[PDB]
Write a protein that binds this ligand. Sequence first.
Ligand SMILES: Nc1nc2c(ncn2[C@@H]2O[C@H](COP(=O)(O)OP(=O)(O)NP(=O)(O)O)[C@@H](O)[C@H]2O)c(=O)[nH]1
Length: 35
Amino acid sequence: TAAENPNVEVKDYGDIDKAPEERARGITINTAHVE
Ligand SMILES: Nc1nc2c(ncn2[C@@H]2O[C@H](COP(=O)(O)OP(=O)(O)NP(=O)(O)O)[C@@H](O)[C@H]2O)c(=O)[nH]1
């Protein structure tokens, strides 16, 4: 969507599973919100 709208911040995979636990287990643990 950010290709169509400059007003969308892109979030990459590692920006979403960013927690130290998530990295340690290699899964999502926390809900993440993106726009
Ligand atoms: N071959 C292939 N692998 C994919 C595809 N989409 C995601 N993956 C791979 O599958 C693995 C899991 O993706 P991920 O997005 O982290 O899964 P999840 O459903 O978010 N995780 P969890 O249930 O822990 O939240 C990753 O290694 C990713 O590269 C796809 O289209 N093709």
